[PDB]
Design an enzyme around this catalytic site. Structure first.
Site, short mmCIF file in Angstrom:
data_model
loop_
_atom_site.label_atom_id
_atom_site.label_comp_id
_atom_site.label_asym_id
_atom_site.label_seq_id
_atom_site.Cartn_x
_atom_site.Cartn_y
_atom_site.Cartn_z
N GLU A 1 -3.80 13.39 2.13
CA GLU A 1 -5.03 12.88 2.70
C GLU A 1 -5.81 14.02 3.33
O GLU A 1 -6.93 14.30 2.93
CB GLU A 1 -4.70 11.78 3.71
N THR B 1 -6.35 5.92 8.57
CA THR B 1 -6.84 6.22 7.22
C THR B 1 -6.76 5.04 6.26
O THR B 1 -7.14 5.16 5.10
CB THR B 1 -6.15 7.44 6.60
N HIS C 1 0.82 -1.22 0.00
CA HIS C 1 0.00 0.00 0.00
C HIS C 1 0.85 1.27 0.00
O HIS C 1 0.49 2.28 -0.59
CB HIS C 1 -0.91 -0.03 1.22
N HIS D 1 5.39 6.66 7.24
CA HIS D 1 5.08 6.30 5.86
C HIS D 1 4.51 7.54 5.19
O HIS D 1 4.25 8.54 5.84
CB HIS D 1 4.06 5.17 5.82
N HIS E 1 3.17 10.65 7.45
CA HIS E 1 2.56 10.29 8.73
C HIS E 1 3.58 9.61 9.62
O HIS E 1 4.09 8.54 9.28
CB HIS E 1 1.39 9.33 8.50
N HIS F 1 1.76 9.07 1.87
CA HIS F 1 0.72 8.92 0.86
C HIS F 1 1.01 9.93 -0.23
O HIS F 1 1.44 11.05 0.07
CB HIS F 1 -0.66 9.21 1.47
N1 LIG Z 1 -2.45 6.35 7.58
S1 LIG Z 1 -2.43 6.28 9.15
O1 LIG Z 1 -3.71 6.73 9.69
O2 LIG Z 1 -1.27 6.92 9.71
C1 LIG Z 1 -2.31 4.59 9.61
N2 LIG Z 1 -3.15 3.64 9.28
C2 LIG Z 1 -2.83 2.40 9.82
C3 LIG Z 1 -3.46 1.18 9.70
C4 LIG Z 1 -3.00 0.04 10.30
C5 LIG Z 1 -1.84 0.10 11.09
C6 LIG Z 1 -1.17 1.30 11.26
C7 LIG Z 1 -1.61 2.45 10.67
S2 LIG Z 1 -1.01 4.09 10.67
ZN LIG Z 2 -0.95 7.33 6.72
#
Ligand SMILES: NS(=O)(=O)c1nc2ccccc2s1
Ligand SMILES: [Zn+2]
Ligand SMILES: NS(=O)(=O)c1nc2ccccc2s1
Length: 259
Positions: free
Chosen positions: A105, A197, A63, A93, A118, A95
């Site tokens: 986002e 998210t 992803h 990570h 993030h 996006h």
């Molecule tokens: N994109 S985020 O909200 O930062 C995020 N989503 C997820 C989902 C599963 C495990 C860790 C994270 S951290």
């Molecule tokens: Zn994220």
């Protein structure tokens, strides 16, 4: 098993069928309306304490890519701001989009940035990440917008390893990386209660979104867009547009740390 993604048939508009909380009351991301957000003089300065951070590994998870840290003790933590207690950095990570006009986002007065970083942290009072995601104050995610302009020197070590993790399930050593090199000058922020998210979309996050974007070069973001969603040897699907659109704010207040 999980078969959600960002494709033409399994993207964000489909997620609710397997993750019904997708239509919940505190979903993320959101649009930040800068004129409606209230300065809150009761908020504190953020404390970003990353001097002792220990990065370990970088992974293409199908992803995005994630840089993982040693979170077995308090090494890199986030405190202060809207937070009570101590939150340990577990991974960061990004996006990003297929072109510079989308990728973030969160949005700011409906403006989309080219990408969003993030930095994900969990509340140590719950002992482990898996317990923390089950609690309304379990996570704190520090979000930072990327715009395209001059290169970000502290990002280059990340971009230069991406060739080695092109496809889903590939990882590489990524020790001795300093995440302080990804921050903007100012720590002014907006904050609101929200969610993960990506699935499972759990409503466990205190969002802290920095107002000042970082600048990255076109060449740096072009390298993000050479990653693949697919596994090795499978038909090539470029890893682009791995962002969830803004969700309804509902009964939530976005607060500003600055006047
Ligand atoms: N994109 S985020 O909200 O930062 C995020 N989503 C997820 C989902 C599963 C495990 C860790 C994270 S951290
Ligand atoms: Zn994220
Ligand atoms: N996005 S999701 O509801 O989790 C999902 N979408 C699809 C589409 C085709 C096959 C399996 C799944 S699982």
């Amino acid at each position: 098993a999980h078969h959600w993604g960002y494709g033409k048939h399994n993207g964000p508009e489909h997620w609710h069928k397997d993750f019904p909380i997708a239509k919940g009351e505190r979903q993320s991301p959101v649009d930040i309306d800068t004129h409606t957000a209230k300065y809150d003089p009761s908020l504190k300065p953020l404390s970003v304490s990353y001097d002792q951070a220990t990065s370990l590994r970088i992974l293409n998870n199908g992803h995005a890519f994630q840089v993982e840290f040693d979170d077995s003790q308090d090494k890199a933590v986030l405190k202060g701001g809207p937070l009570d207690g101590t939150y340990r950095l577990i991974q960061f990570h990004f996006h990003w989009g297929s072109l510079d006009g989308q990728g973030s986002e969160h949005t700011v007065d409906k403006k989309k940035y080219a990408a969003e970083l993030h930095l994900t942290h969990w509340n140590t009072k719950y002992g482990d990440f898996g317990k923390a995601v089950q609690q309304p104050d379990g996570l704190a995610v520090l979000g930072i917008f990327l715009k395209v302009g001059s290169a970000k020197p502290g990002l280059q070590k990340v971009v230069d390893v991406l060739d080695s993790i092109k496809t889903k399930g590939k990882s590489a050593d990524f020790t001795n990386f300093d995440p302080r090199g990804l921050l903007p000058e100012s720590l002014d922020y907006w904050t609101y209660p929200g969610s993960l998210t990506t699935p499972p979309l759990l409503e466990c996050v205190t969002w802290i979104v920095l107002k000042e974007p970082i600048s990255v070069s076109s060449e740096q973001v072009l390298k993000f867009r050479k990653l693949n969603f697919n596994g090795e040897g499978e038909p090539e699907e470029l890893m682009v547009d791995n962002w969830r659109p803004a969700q309804p704010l509902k009964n939530r207040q976005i607060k500003a740390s600055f006047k």
